[PDB]
Design a protein around this ligand. Structure first.
Ligand SMILES: Cc1ccc2c(-c3ccncc3)c(-c3ccc(F)cc3)nn2c1
Length: 306
């Protein structure tokens, strides 16, 4: 059948997110474009239904798309959400694998706000990477704002009613993306709010430099590769990552790395820290982004870029 969930016509496949089977589509009642993620209906570790509830739990938060349907349709499981634009990894590539300091600050404060409101709903994200932060669609209100998708790695970190934190714990299996994950993750420690923020600091330097110094390491196995990346993260001072860059990014990474395990990070203080970079450089926080100058001032386009 060309239509799932009663109302959603399946369209072009876009197969992001685990190669994890995503299509674009349209709501046949109101023309609203949607993203449709299928998932094999029987699985050991099915994430689609708790991902649906995660979107509902975060419903109304800015930068988090609506979920309109989760259901059946025979062979798979379906989740329908708002359709968004390219990822920050995509735009990073099209901009030459380098973001200006201005673009990094502006995207950083929106990412900090996104993660904060995930944390405010008693969840840690635990899969921070530029591939899961998406901009909006062209000619939309939110075309160039950052959004957050894919909550398959999310976990409750405090009880919602009592607000009491999960116990600290160790010897957890290392999974996530090794390029960005916190040092604590490398050591098998239970993740918490600070670890989402340390991962963000890694992305910030990734954007600013074009590369992180623990990229391109090799080992016989994956486990040993993860260990070498973790070793590099701990012998590279934040001040050397930020050689030639505004020192507020080194102070950011240093401070979130030293946060206590259950501590509530000072999100607004971190945002003011990064905002001060623009003041030291005489720039304004006006929403102008590097990718908005792509292709003569038209921005990203499918024929030329991807
Ligand atoms: C790496 C990556 C990139 C984009 C993207 C979409 C995405 C792409 C474009 N517009 C909206 C979403 C989603 C997605 C997740 C869950 C779902 F139910 C539907 C879509 N995952 N995902 C994962």
């Amino acid at each position: 059948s060309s239509v799932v969930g009663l109302h959603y016509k399946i369209g072009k496949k876009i197969g992001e997110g685990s190669f994890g089977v995503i299509f674009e589509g349209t709501n046949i009642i109101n023309g609203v474009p949607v993203a449709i993620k299928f998932e094999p209906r029987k699985t050991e570790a099915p994430q689609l239904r708790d991902e649906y509830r995660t979107y509902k739990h975060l419903q109304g938060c800015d930068g988090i798309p609506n979920a309109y349907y989760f259901g059946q349709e025979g062979l798979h499981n379906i989740l329908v959400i708002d359709l968004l634009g390219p990822s920050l990894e995509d735009l990073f590539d099209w901009c030459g694998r380098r973001f200006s300091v201005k673009t990094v600050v502006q995207v950083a404060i929106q990412m900090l706000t996104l993660v904060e409101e995930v944390h405010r709903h008693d969840l840690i994200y635990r899969d921070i990477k530029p591939d899961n932060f998406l901009i909006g669609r062209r000619g939309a209100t939110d075309e160039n704002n950052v959004h957050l998708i894919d909550f398959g790695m999310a976990k409750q970190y405090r009880d919602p009613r009592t607000k009491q934190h999960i116990p600290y714990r160790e010897k957890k299996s290392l999974s996530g993306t090794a390029r960005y994950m916190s040092i604590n993750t490398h050591l098998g420690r239970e993740q918490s709010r600070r670890d989402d923020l340390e991962a963000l600091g890694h992305v910030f330097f990734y954007f600013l430099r074009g590369q992180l110094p623990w990229q391109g390491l090799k080992a016989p196995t994956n486990k040993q590769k993860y260990e070498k990346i973790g070793d590099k993260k701990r012998t590279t001072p934040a001040v050397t990552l930020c050689d030639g860059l505004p020192q507020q990014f080194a102070e950011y990474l240093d401070s979130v790395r030293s946060l206590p395990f259950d501590a509530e990070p000072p999100y607004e203080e971190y945002r003011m820290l990064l905002l001060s970079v623009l003041d030291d450089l005489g720039q304004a926080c006006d929403g102008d982004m590097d990718w908005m100058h792509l292709n003569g001032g038209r921005g990203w386009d499918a024929t030329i870029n991807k």
